[PDB]
Amino acid sequence: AGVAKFAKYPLTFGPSPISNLNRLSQHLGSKVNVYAKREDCNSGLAFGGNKLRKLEYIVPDIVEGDYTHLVSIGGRQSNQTRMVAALAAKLGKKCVLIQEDWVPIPEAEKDVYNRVGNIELSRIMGADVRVIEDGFDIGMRKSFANALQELEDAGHKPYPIPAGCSEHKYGGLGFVGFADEVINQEVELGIKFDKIVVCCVTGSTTAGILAGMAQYGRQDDVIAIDASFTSEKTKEQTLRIANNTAKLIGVEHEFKDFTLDTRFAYPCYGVPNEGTIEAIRTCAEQEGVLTDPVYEGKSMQGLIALIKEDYFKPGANVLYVHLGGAPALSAYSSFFPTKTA
Amino acid sequence: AGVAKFAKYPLTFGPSPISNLNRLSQHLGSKVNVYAKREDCNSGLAFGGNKLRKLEYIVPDIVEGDYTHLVSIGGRQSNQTRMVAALAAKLGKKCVLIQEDWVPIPEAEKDVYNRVGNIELSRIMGADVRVIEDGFDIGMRKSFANALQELEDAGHKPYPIPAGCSEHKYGGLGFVGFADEVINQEVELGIKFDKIVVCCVTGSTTAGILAGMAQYGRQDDVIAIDASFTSEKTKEQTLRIANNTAKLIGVEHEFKDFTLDTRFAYPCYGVPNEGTIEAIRTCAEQEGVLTDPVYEGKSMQGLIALIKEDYFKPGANVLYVHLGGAPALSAYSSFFPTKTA
Ligand SMILES: *Cc1c(COP(=O)(O)O)cnc(C)c1O
Ligand SMILES: *Cc1c(COP(=O)(O)O)cnc(C)c1O
C-alpha cells in the first residue's frame, strides 16, 4: 500500500473540498446526511474535474520524456479532451483531440451540440480538434492509433492518453490518492463516510477509489452508478483497472466484483432520461450545485433513488463524488424549460 | 480597518488561491511576474465568482429578518443573477431575476445567447427568470423597482439585490476583506504585490479593494480595466461606493479619483474586440486558464497591453484578479473557431 512511491505533478489547488449538502438532505427525508467531495472545484485549469486528479500521476512521464503532442479522445462534449487541452497548454505542448460521435445528437440540439460546451473550450485553448463520427466505446478505438501513427510519421513525438485516462498504466493512481485524502478529511472534519457514491463509464475513477479504499479494507464502501448503459464492458474494464492498480500500489486484495447499480444508464450514453433531469433540478434547486445530463446527473438521481428506498442505514453519512462535467450543460439546454414560475 | 465588525455568512471555500502564471509571464517577454487571485474558483455554488464574495456580507441581513424572495438584475448572460439563484436556492428562498437586454446579441449568437450559458443555469436552479427588453445601465433599474412592488403586492417579502450588489449598502465590504487576504497572502508568499489589475463595470469589486488597500495606505496600487464602455458613470459609481464603504470600516482617506484604463471596453459592454479574442486565446494557450469575452477577457487584454508598453517596473509582481465569468463563454462560440495547425 503506497501511491507515494509514484511521481506526481501538481495540477490542483490541493485536497478537493467537501460540501455539506445539508439542505438537500432534509428535502429528501432527512434519512441520510449527504456530503459532496468537490472534484469539480479541482483547479484553475479550465474549470477542473476528476480527470485532473488522474493526470497528476501521468504528467511526470510526459515531462521526463521528449514529447511534443498530447493526443486523447472522447465523445463530442468530452470532459477529458477539454482537460487534456488545458494540460497541454500548461506544459507548453501541442494538443490533438479526436471527438467521436458517441451520443445520438438530440435533434433540438443538433446545431449546438458540436459547437458549444466543452468542445468550444478545447478550441479556445488551441487544440487540434477533429470531429469524427465513429461509434461509442470505452475501450481502445481505431482512430486514436491512426492519429498517433500520423503525427509520428510526421516526425512528431505524440503521447497517448486513452478515453478518460482509464486504460493508461497510471490511470488508476490519482483516485488511489483520492482514497488517502478522504481518510484524512474524515479526521479533520470529524465525520465518517459509510458509503461513497460515484458515476462510472470508463473505469479509473471507480477502480482507483476501490483499490485505494482497499488499503483500509473499505472497498465495500464504494457504490458505482453506471452511466454508459453498457454494464457489460464497464464492469469488466473497471474491475481490470482495479486489479492492475492494486498491484501497483502494493494491495494484495483481488477484486472480483463491485457495486455497479445499472438502473439509471438508459436510454444510453449522453442521453438523459426523465429521472436524470429531475435529479439535476432537485440538486440545483436545493443546493445550488449543478450536475450534467451525461454523468453526474445520472449518478445524482441514483443517489436519490437509493435514498428514497432506505438503502442506507438511518443517519448514514454518504459521500457523493462530484466529478464535475457541468460545462457540457449548455449542449443540453433544450431539456430544462424555465420553471413554471 | 474594521470589516470585522460586520457579520459574514460563509459562501466560499475560504481565502481565494493565487495561481502563478509564470508561463504567460515568460510569453510576455519576462517583463513582470504575473499572479492571478482566483475568485473564479472560490465556491461550489455553481462556478462561484466575485459576486459571491460580495454576497457574504449581505446574507446575514437577509436571514435575520423575514424575506421570501431574493431579487437581483443584470444582462442576459449575467453572472450576478446566476449567483443570486444559487444563493437563494441554498438559503431556501425564492428567486426572481430580471434579465435586461444589455448587449447587442451577435447575429451568429441570436439563437443561443438566451438559451445557453448563465441564463440556463439560473433556470435549472429554478429561479423566476424574466427576459426584459430594457437597455444597459449600471444604475437602479425601473424593471427592478417594479418587481419589488409586484411581489410585495402579492403579499410576499422580497429582498433587493441591485446589479452586481454594487449599490447595496454593504456591497463594498466584500472586497475590503479581499484587501486583507492580499496582505496576509503576501506574507505567506514572502513577496509583495506592486500592482493589482481588476475588471470593473458596476463598481463594488474595485471599490472594496480601494477602501481596503487604503487601510494600509496602498490605494494607488489598484488598477481597474473598464469593460462597460461608459467610463464616466462606471468611474462615478465606483468612486461613490468606495467612499461610503471607507466610512463604514473607519478609513478616513477620501477617494476623489482612481486608475481606470478604458482602452479596451470598445466597442461596447458585452462585445469583445479582436484584441479580447486574442487575449482570451493567449491566456488559454499559455496557462489553460479561461477568461470571458465580456469582462475578464478585456481585463486580460489590457493586462497584456500594459505589460508590452512597459507600464510596470521590471520584475514587478502584478496580481491580476480573475473574477470568473467563464460560464457565459458558451454564448460566444462563433468568435472562437478551431485554430489551424
Ligand atoms: C469523465 C467523467 C466521469 C467518468 O469517469 P470514469 O473514471 O471514466 O468512470 C464521470 N463524471 C464526470 C463529470 C466526468 O467528467
Ligand atoms: C460582476 C463581474 C465583474 C464586475 O464587478 P464590479 O464590482 O461590478 O466592477 C467583473 N467580472 C466578472 C466576471 C463579473 O461577474
XYZ file of N, CA and C in Angstrom, chain A residues 100-219:
360
model
N -15.199 11.873 -31.255
C -16.060 10.908 -31.934
C -17.527 11.108 -31.556
N -18.430 10.574 -32.371
C -19.850 10.699 -32.088
C -20.293 9.516 -31.245
N -20.350 9.724 -29.937
C -20.746 8.665 -29.025
C -22.187 8.818 -28.546
N -22.750 10.014 -28.694
C -24.126 10.241 -28.263
C -25.031 10.652 -29.416
N -26.214 10.018 -29.528
C -27.153 10.354 -30.603
C -27.557 11.807 -30.421
N -26.838 12.691 -31.103
C -27.067 14.125 -31.031
C -28.548 14.498 -31.109
N -29.172 14.802 -29.954
C -30.588 15.175 -29.922
C -30.889 16.238 -30.976
N -32.006 16.061 -31.672
C -32.429 16.967 -32.733
C -32.459 18.444 -32.328
N -33.235 18.762 -31.297
C -33.362 20.138 -30.818
C -32.048 20.713 -30.286
N -30.941 20.031 -30.571
C -29.634 20.472 -30.105
C -28.556 20.139 -31.134
N -28.975 19.589 -32.270
C -28.057 19.200 -33.336
C -27.234 20.350 -33.919
N -27.665 21.582 -33.669
C -26.962 22.752 -34.189
C -25.990 23.396 -33.202
N -25.954 22.898 -31.969
C -25.061 23.467 -30.965
C -24.221 22.416 -30.249
N -24.721 21.186 -30.232
C -24.041 20.083 -29.567
C -22.592 19.891 -30.022
N -22.243 20.452 -31.176
C -20.888 20.311 -31.691
C -20.126 21.632 -31.799
N -20.656 22.681 -31.177
C -20.006 23.987 -31.224
C -19.898 24.612 -29.840
N -20.927 24.423 -29.024
C -20.957 24.981 -27.677
C -20.573 23.927 -26.638
N -20.220 24.370 -25.435
C -19.860 23.430 -24.387
C -18.371 23.236 -24.157
N -17.964 21.988 -23.959
C -16.561 21.692 -23.722
C -15.744 21.752 -25.001
N -16.315 21.285 -26.106
C -15.595 21.276 -27.378
C -15.129 22.681 -27.778
N -15.865 23.688 -27.317
C -15.553 25.089 -27.591
C -14.286 25.460 -26.837
N -14.213 25.008 -25.586
C -13.076 25.288 -24.717
C -11.765 24.676 -25.222
N -11.824 23.468 -25.769
C -10.625 22.828 -26.295
C -10.092 23.713 -27.417
N -11.017 24.277 -28.196
C -10.675 25.153 -29.318
C -10.016 26.433 -28.833
N -10.666 27.103 -27.890
C -10.137 28.339 -27.336
C -8.735 28.150 -26.776
N -8.422 26.931 -26.345
C -7.106 26.645 -25.782
C -6.082 26.208 -26.835
N -6.476 26.297 -28.104
C -5.592 25.962 -29.211
C -5.300 24.513 -29.553
N -6.244 23.614 -29.317
C -6.017 22.206 -29.618
C -6.505 21.801 -31.011
N -5.788 20.881 -31.647
C -6.162 20.391 -32.974
C -7.397 19.503 -32.830
N -8.568 20.120 -32.718
C -9.814 19.377 -32.571
C -10.236 18.744 -33.891
N -10.642 17.478 -33.846
C -11.072 16.762 -35.046
C -12.403 16.043 -34.823
N -13.409 16.412 -35.612
C -14.745 15.834 -35.496
C -14.979 14.589 -36.346
N -14.846 13.417 -35.732
C -15.064 12.155 -36.431
C -16.409 11.614 -35.960
N -17.008 10.702 -36.722
C -18.312 10.151 -36.344
C -18.297 8.643 -36.080
N -17.270 8.167 -35.380
C -17.162 6.745 -35.068
C -18.039 6.382 -33.861
N -18.269 5.085 -33.663
C -19.109 4.622 -32.570
C -18.608 4.838 -31.151
N -19.511 4.673 -30.186
C -19.188 4.837 -28.770
C -18.544 3.583 -28.209
N -17.482 3.772 -27.435
C -16.774 2.648 -26.848
C -15.770 3.135 -25.804
N -15.878 2.596 -24.591
C -14.986 2.981 -23.506
C -13.639 2.274 -23.607
N -13.394 1.629 -24.743
C -12.138 0.925 -24.942
C -11.277 1.572 -26.010
N -10.141 0.949 -26.312
C -9.234 1.473 -27.326
C -9.972 1.592 -28.659
N -9.869 2.756 -29.297
C -10.540 2.995 -30.574
C -9.546 2.998 -31.742
N -10.005 2.574 -32.920
C -9.144 2.525 -34.100
C -9.149 3.826 -34.892
N -8.939 4.930 -34.190
C -8.884 6.252 -34.803
C -7.838 6.994 -33.986
N -7.646 6.499 -32.770
C -6.680 7.038 -31.828
C -5.302 6.554 -32.277
N -5.222 5.268 -32.604
C -3.979 4.649 -33.044
C -3.452 5.269 -34.335
N -4.373 5.603 -35.229
C -4.024 6.188 -36.512
C -3.558 7.629 -36.346
N -4.171 8.341 -35.408
C -3.788 9.719 -35.151
C -2.333 9.688 -34.707
N -2.024 8.734 -33.832
C -0.670 8.560 -33.317
C 0.275 8.313 -34.486
N -0.006 7.254 -35.241
C 0.807 6.878 -36.391
C 1.065 8.070 -37.308
N 0.041 8.897 -37.497
C 0.140 10.082 -38.344
C 1.188 11.068 -37.833
N 0.977 11.571 -36.619
C 1.898 12.524 -36.008
C 3.317 11.966 -35.965
N 3.436 10.656 -35.748
C 4.744 10.007 -35.709
C 5.373 10.079 -37.095
N 4.638 9.608 -38.100
C 5.125 9.633 -39.474
C 5.424 11.063 -39.903
N 4.873 12.026 -39.172
C 5.086 13.431 -39.491
C 6.379 13.930 -38.862
N 6.994 13.081 -38.047
C 8.235 13.456 -37.393
C 7.989 14.041 -36.017
N 6.813 13.766 -35.464
C 6.459 14.270 -34.143
C 6.467 13.152 -33.108
N 6.531 13.532 -31.833
C 6.538 12.564 -30.740
C 5.282 12.722 -29.889
N 4.212 11.997 -30.252
C 2.912 12.011 -29.572
C 2.886 11.245 -28.251
N 1.987 11.647 -27.358
C 1.838 10.966 -26.083
C 0.409 10.452 -26.007
N 0.231 9.122 -26.006
C -1.102 8.519 -25.943
C -1.789 8.636 -24.587
N -3.012 9.156 -24.602
C -3.806 9.320 -23.391
C -5.242 8.884 -23.695
N -5.528 7.578 -23.543
C -6.830 6.946 -23.783
C -8.055 7.598 -23.125
N -9.232 7.207 -23.610
C -10.506 7.722 -23.125
C -10.629 7.760 -21.612
N -10.685 8.969 -21.064
C -10.827 9.133 -19.631
C -9.613 8.727 -18.822
N -8.509 8.465 -19.518
C -7.248 8.052 -18.901
C -7.310 6.598 -18.461
N -8.499 6.175 -18.054
C -8.727 4.827 -17.562
C -7.743 3.749 -17.980
N -7.605 3.506 -19.278
C -6.698 2.460 -19.716
C -5.231 2.839 -19.774
N -4.864 3.928 -19.110
C -3.463 4.336 -19.070
C -2.845 3.589 -17.888
N -1.579 3.213 -18.017
C -0.884 2.485 -16.960
C -1.144 3.064 -15.569
N -0.995 4.384 -15.441
C -1.185 5.071 -14.171
C -2.542 5.720 -14.038
N -3.477 5.290 -14.883
C -4.817 5.848 -14.871
C -5.597 5.663 -13.588
N -5.220 4.673 -12.784
C -5.931 4.429 -11.540
C -5.277 4.987 -10.288
N -4.097 5.575 -10.432
C -3.379 6.112 -9.276
C -3.981 7.369 -8.664
N -4.402 8.307 -9.502
C -4.987 9.532 -8.982
C -6.055 9.310 -7.923
N -6.997 8.414 -8.187
C -8.050 8.177 -7.211
C -7.675 7.253 -6.060
N -6.485 6.664 -6.142
C -5.996 5.864 -5.024
C -5.688 6.974 -4.014
N -5.048 8.036 -4.500
C -4.713 9.161 -3.640
C -5.977 9.867 -3.177
N -7.060 9.690 -3.931
C -8.348 10.278 -3.560
C -8.724 9.607 -2.235
N -8.592 8.285 -2.208
C -8.912 7.499 -1.013
C -8.090 7.964 0.190
N -6.774 8.092 0.027
C -5.933 8.536 1.140
C -6.412 9.888 1.645
N -6.955 10.692 0.730
C -7.448 12.029 1.046
C -8.731 12.021 1.881
N -9.705 11.222 1.467
C -10.961 11.143 2.220
C -10.662 10.671 3.651
N -9.761 9.698 3.756
C -9.383 9.182 5.063
C -8.893 10.290 5.977
N -8.099 11.225 5.461
C -7.604 12.313 6.312
C -8.695 13.351 6.593
N -9.485 13.665 5.574
C -10.552 14.644 5.746
C -11.598 14.155 6.738
N -11.752 12.836 6.843
C -12.706 12.296 7.816
C -12.255 12.685 9.211
N -10.941 12.721 9.436
C -10.439 13.083 10.755
C -10.453 14.578 10.971
N -10.141 15.335 9.927
C -10.160 16.774 10.101
C -11.600 17.266 10.275
N -12.520 16.733 9.474
C -13.929 17.135 9.574
C -14.657 16.487 10.759
N -14.277 15.255 11.093
C -14.911 14.564 12.212
C -16.189 13.886 11.782
N -16.149 13.318 10.588
C -17.296 12.656 10.003
C -16.801 11.437 9.235
N -17.412 10.283 9.480
C -17.021 9.077 8.769
C -18.026 8.797 7.689
N -17.534 8.492 6.498
C -18.405 8.193 5.380
C -18.622 6.690 5.324
N -19.885 6.294 5.461
C -20.275 4.895 5.440
C -20.260 4.380 4.021
N -20.506 5.275 3.074
C -20.513 4.891 1.670
C -20.044 6.013 0.736
N -19.590 5.624 -0.449
C -19.110 6.571 -1.443
C -19.852 6.335 -2.751
N -20.575 7.351 -3.218
C -21.322 7.228 -4.460
C -20.616 8.019 -5.569
N -20.337 7.350 -6.684
C -19.651 7.982 -7.797
C -20.063 7.377 -9.136
N -20.153 8.229 -10.155
C -20.529 7.817 -11.504
C -19.403 6.982 -12.136
N -19.728 6.163 -13.139
C -18.725 5.307 -13.782
C -19.061 4.876 -15.213
N -18.096 5.034 -16.124
C -18.276 4.606 -17.511
C -16.974 4.023 -18.097
N -15.840 4.706 -17.953
C -14.588 4.152 -18.483
C -13.754 3.425 -17.415
N -14.039 3.679 -16.138
C -13.320 2.969 -15.092
C -12.452 3.636 -14.031
N -11.217 3.976 -14.400
C -10.236 4.567 -13.483
C -10.703 5.287 -12.210
N -11.713 6.146 -12.286
C -12.168 6.850 -11.076
C -12.701 5.897 -10.002
N -13.531 4.956 -10.438
C -14.123 3.960 -9.550
C -13.031 3.000 -9.089
N -12.371 2.375 -10.061
C -11.287 1.427 -9.807
C -10.255 2.012 -8.851
N -9.842 3.241 -9.126
C -8.870 3.887 -8.273
C -9.387 4.022 -6.861
N -10.663 4.369 -6.708
C -11.239 4.534 -5.372
C -11.332 3.195 -4.647
N -11.604 2.130 -5.393
C -11.705 0.785 -4.819
C -10.338 0.308 -4.314
N -9.376 0.203 -5.231
C -8.024 -0.227 -4.878
C -7.468 0.636 -3.746
N -7.754 1.930 -3.805
C -7.275 2.843 -2.783
C -7.974 2.691 -1.448
N -9.269 2.402 -1.473
C -10.005 2.237 -0.225
C -9.662 0.880 0.380
N -9.280 -0.057 -0.483
C -8.897 -1.401 -0.067
C -7.779 -1.278 0.959
N -6.899 -0.305 0.743
C -5.789 -0.054 1.649
C -6.257 -0.098 3.100
N -7.480 0.361 3.334
C -8.027 0.355 4.676
C -9.165 -0.667 4.734
N -9.141 -1.611 3.799
C -10.164 -2.645 3.735
C -11.590 -2.124 3.654
N -11.796 -1.067 2.869
C -13.118 -0.470 2.744
C -13.712 -0.443 1.338
N -13.132 -1.192 0.407
C -13.634 -1.239 -0.965
C -15.163 -1.324 -1.014
